[PDB]
Write an enzyme that holds these catalytic residues in place. Structure first.
Site, PDB file in Angstrom:
ATOM      1  CB  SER A 185      -1.053   0.054   1.163  1.00 14.20           C
ATOM      2  OG  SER A 185      -1.995   1.135   0.928  1.00 14.20           O
ATOM      3  CG  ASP A 227      -3.834  -4.051  -2.912  1.00 12.69           C
ATOM      4  OD1 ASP A 227      -4.092  -4.058  -4.169  1.00 12.69           O
ATOM      5  OD2 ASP A 227      -4.717  -4.268  -2.005  1.00 12.69           O
ATOM      6  CG  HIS A 239      -5.745  -2.236   1.012  1.00 12.53           C
ATOM      7  ND1 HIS A 239      -4.874  -2.317  -0.055  1.00 12.53           N
ATOM      8  CD2 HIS A 239      -5.312  -1.209   1.784  1.00 12.53           C
ATOM      9  CE1 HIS A 239      -3.960  -1.370   0.058  1.00 12.53           C
ATOM     10  NE2 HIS A 239      -4.205  -0.684   1.159  1.00 12.53           N
TER      11      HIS A 239
END
Length: 371
Positions: A220, A243, A298
């Site tokens: 992320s 991600d 996520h």
């Protein structure tokens, strides 16, 4: 433990290193192939302030802080705390970057699985004001007495987001490089005094690194960090963005990434404006891979996906349709295959090479988003 044990042959130790004691020093948790395999005694979230930061980040009441601590304050993760390092080998090294609102201990499922296949993993805690919380010491005396100064996540205004997030990803890239420089200095015998007073003797790491076989992995915000780090620091031979969130990155960086780069996505996190920046990293010459894990969310990449049960986990979006252990196995194996390809490793991991191309019922080559 709810956090799955490593799937490799090696047994796993864990420890924390802070050097120097300032907020300009490195702070990391280390997962490593250990000798002994007594107990899986490592504290997952070691300080109450991490729970307080998590509530600040989540945007909830004063109370949520204490509830979280009540619920997870004694949860452990399957690694041997301070257990000695396994001697007689040089290990490849992964540096790992956490996401927005996370910190260094939240990706042990990944760290422990890499370690259990003979990696040393250095999970950095960032001091860019992106961690839900982190700490440092004012001076040596403070450090001696465990008198911590805590630094909480900064919430930004919309008008400063673009600039503040770019400055943060550059700070994060600097901290991954500094963590790598610290570990390489140690491998070559630099004396280090750990500001944390823990049993683990850091000098054990002399001559224990394969200084050619270095990789940066991240989730992320940590996936943006991967790319900034590769752009800035040629010692890293390859990166895996889990991600990635691409907003922090400058326009200028996408053309400036020599190394092989693996994008591993969940299904539900992704959106056009994000997949567009990913694809900007593409070139006929430079090697890039992309896969999407189907039904995944996520949080499938972080340990919170193992912290609750299926119905709460599913409710809170800690869990996706695909099962948690299944999603993480897939991410891990694909990662291993890709590290063994672009690091030059001598292990059995190319048995998962098909995962890099998107070949399992549970993966999409590339993305389902179009652009």
């Amino acid at each position: 433990t709810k956090i799955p044990r490593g799937n490799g042959p090696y047994s796993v130790g864990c420890t924390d290193l802070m050097f120097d004691h300032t907020n300009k020093g490195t702070f990391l948790r280390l997962y490593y192939p250990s000798q002994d395999n007594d107990r899986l005694d490592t504290l997952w979230i070691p300080n109450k302030e991490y729970f307080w930061g998590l509530s600040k980040f989540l945007g909830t009441h004063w109370l949520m802080g204490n509830i979280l601590r009540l619920l997870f304050g004694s949860m452990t993760t399957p690694a041997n705390w301070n257990s000695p390092l396994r001697p007689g080998e040089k290990y490849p090294l992964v540096v790992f970057s956490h996401g927005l609102g996370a910190f260094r201990t939240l990706y042990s499922a990944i760290g422990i699985d890499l370690a259990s296949h003979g990696f040393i993993v250095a999970a950095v805690e960032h001091r860019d004001r992106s961690a839900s919380a982190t700490y440092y010491f004012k001076d040596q005396s403070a450090a001696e007495i465990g008198d911590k100064s805590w630094l909480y996540l900064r919430t930004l205004k919309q008008e400063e987001e673009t600039h503040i997030r770019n400055e943060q990803v550059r700070q994060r890239a600097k901290e991954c490089s500094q963590a790598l420089s610290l570990i390489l200095d140690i491998d070559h015998g630099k004396p280090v005094k750990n500001a944390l007073d823990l049993k683990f003797d850091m000098e054990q790491l002399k001559d224990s690194i394969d200084r050619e076989k270095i990789a940066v992995i991240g989730h992320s915000f940590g996936g943006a960090t991967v790319i900034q780090t590769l752009s800035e620091d040629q010692r890293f031979r390859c990166g895996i963005a889990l991600d990635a969130w691409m907003f922090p990155l400058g326009d200028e960086v996408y053309s400036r990434i020599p190394q092989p780069l693996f994008f591993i996505n969940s299904e539900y996190f992704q959106y056009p404006a994000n997949i567009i920046k990913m694809k900007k990293c593409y070139s006929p010459d430079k090697e890039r891979k992309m896969i999407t894990i189907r039904g995944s969310v996520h949080q499938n990449f972080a340990d919170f996906t193992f912290a609750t049960g299926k119905i709460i986990g599913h409710m809170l979006k800690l869990k996706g349709d695909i099962d948690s252990n299944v999603a993480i196995d897939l991410s891990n194996k694909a990662s291993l295959a890709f590290l063994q390809k672009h690091l030059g490793l001598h292990k059995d991991f190319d048995q998962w090479d098909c995962l890099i191309e998107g070949d399992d019922e549970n993966l999409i080559p590339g993305t389902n988003i179009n652009t």
